Amino acid sequence: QAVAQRAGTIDVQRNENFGKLRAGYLFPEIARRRKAHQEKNPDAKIISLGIGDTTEPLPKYIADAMAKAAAGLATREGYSGYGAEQGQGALREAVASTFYGHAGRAADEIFISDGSKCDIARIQMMFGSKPTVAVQDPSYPVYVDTSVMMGMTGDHNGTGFDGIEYMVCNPDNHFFPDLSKAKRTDIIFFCSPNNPTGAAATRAQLTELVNFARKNGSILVYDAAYALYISNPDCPKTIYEIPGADEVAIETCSFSKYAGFTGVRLGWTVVPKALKYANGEPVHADWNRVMTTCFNGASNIVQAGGLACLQPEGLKEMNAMIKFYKENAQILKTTFTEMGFSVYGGDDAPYIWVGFPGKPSWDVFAEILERCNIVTTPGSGYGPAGEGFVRASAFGSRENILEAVRRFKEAYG
Amino acid sequence: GTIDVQRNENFGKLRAGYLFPEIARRRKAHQEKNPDAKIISLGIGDTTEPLPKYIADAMAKAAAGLATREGYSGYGAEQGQGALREAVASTFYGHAGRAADEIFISDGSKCDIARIQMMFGSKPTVAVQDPSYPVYVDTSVMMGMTGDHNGTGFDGIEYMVCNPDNHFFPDLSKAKRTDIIFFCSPNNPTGAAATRAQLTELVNFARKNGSILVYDAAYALYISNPDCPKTIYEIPGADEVAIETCSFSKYAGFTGVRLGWTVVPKALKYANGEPVHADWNRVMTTCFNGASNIVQAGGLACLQPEGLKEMNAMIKFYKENAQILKTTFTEMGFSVYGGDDAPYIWVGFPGKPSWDVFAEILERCNIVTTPGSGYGPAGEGFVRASAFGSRENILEAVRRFKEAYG
């Protein structure tokens, strides 16, 4: 019949929350802008210091663990077990003892997933639309964008979204917000080291943050994805090194490509049993319900790679890879500082954060791409307080980092 | 206490934990009471047979190769590798109109259903086939799309009841209109594969009502009957109303694999014209980090000629297991459904609660099954038995069932 030759029919309205979003997500838009630039300039040899997708080859001890788990699928049955789609016990024990020995977290509070971004979306589903949110500003834009999608916010106001408390971190406050003036919210999202500024909060700063959350009765979602890169002994690698954090904080961590590991999609969350909603219900029970209902369990291939990373040879190879990326960050930082720019980060994180005052950061991004054929990311893509800066990733080969430096000195030196 | 955030009200609407973890817990408790019992699971379906080696090979080579390549960078795409999207579009939708840019590769269908529910939000009304795998009801409840539980099901859900007397297809002339309709074919747990005429009626009903149809084709690889479409897009006009979810994960029979896809046609538009594909792409790029390239290499190998030959042999094996189970029960006088187009059977145990039949089978036969009431209100009165297991264990389960019930 004619019906099948015709459009249309559908009476469901678009979710109002998606209409609030202003632009597509930052990293896909940067990849699209890079592709458009290569279409305009087919001969350009583009170096990406943008999204961070050009991670170096994975440590062989980890790759080999994953390969052997994959090949082993041909000679075993499917696994069966109550303990658990929460993640293999051996991996959750290795994560608990490697990262949370001093910090007191148990294996049964660790939940292994396929990535931190996926877990942030699932946390937001767990919170639902009612809670109010505060976000460190600038920050990786998953926190704001998932808050908007879940309906936790008002409309965009031309600078940020109404209803989000942006906790501004900048050079003048040493990248830590003024909590004596910060508004109370239900949820606080905080990252250390922060992406994009590279700032790793000090022990005294995190003690302030935990005491702020506790006084306000807020849940703190703490992103420690880049904590492997912290060098300063005064900057904790987990929020659980702070007394009282177990009653307010959920931590998210990543061993994925985002954190520097080629080919990996793996993270975890920590939800302490001590963390309880206002009427006493444990957050851990609801998180477990989300993880068993909305998720299918991280693959046993990737969990084999995570467990290998935590064995002696895996830690040795991982540490060498972290040291290589940090040396790339220092090469980029020194290049910019010798040219007279103000540069932040690169000491505790594998990227740097460069001031370009007086021009919108999206225009700077376009100018660097035009003049140097280098992709960076614009600071305004990380929220209102990101305007005036650009981030450059250290995830790349040493030859590409060195060619980028040559190109930057030629254009800007 | 020191936290003032209230629990999400929608989590208080859930009455019990999720079905599959509870079956696993029951199995473990039974084993602890009976440490010498040799328990055969025909329950969750976790005991899938070893993965076809051509797939495992591709995954191992992709993993090993991580040690000698840089991270991938590319516009085409955080939706999944182009070669795999093209292979899915050609293999599964070559006569059904779908393009590679309508395919979104993920790490599994249950994660996609939760992300779909996020995209829809709390305002839409939901109809769910009943019985069905409980992710559709439970995610609807978590997202705030429903009222409270009422003793049988949740208020605010239109249950579309499929049973033996209606040939496992609801009476659409009497079904209330909703915004979203979740339907699966073959259905888990009944095994029913909707016919071409039935799916034409479903697509017509969705189009007349202006509803979005979310169609789960996870088990369509197991369909034998040529009258039963393997994708909703075989029905003219389905591109204007339907999203399809599919799985190549352990759920669909593939040991070790966490891989699925969704189809969101470019044609599918909300009431005021906005494309659903654009919001789904926003979700998949914001709320997800892209399926591993190890598992996508497995997916691509499964669709090459040797992969398909080995996958087809695996499907044929599980279907033989399902026929062995089905024959056993029918010879004992039970009414049995499924097994012909799905790798599980659905057996009538009228007059006793299915959770009591679950307990009885586990105590008398040391066999795990799943109770039909775990799949919604119209699942009561039945038990599902999975065909995902070794031939030795299937044969031993049949021996035990004959001793107990024959």
Author numbering:
A (entry chain B): 26 to 438
B (entry chain A): 33 to 438
Text of the article:
The DAP/lys pathway can be divided into three parts. three steps that bypassed by the reaction catalyzed by DapL. as a pyridoxal phosphate (PLP)-dependent transferase-like fold by SCOP. enzyme, the algal enzyme is specific for L,L-DAP.
Cr-DapL is a dimer in solution. demonstrating that the enzyme DapL is dimeric in solution. The predicted mass of the dimer is 97.66 kDa. two monomers in the asymmetric unit. V-shaped monomer and comprises residues from both monomers in the dimer. residues that are contributed from the opposing monomer in the dimer. Numbering is based on the Cr-DapL structure. substrate recognition, fills the space that would be taken by the PLP cofactor. active site does not easily fit the cyclic THDPA species. strain expressing the algal enzyme is able to grow on DAP-free media.
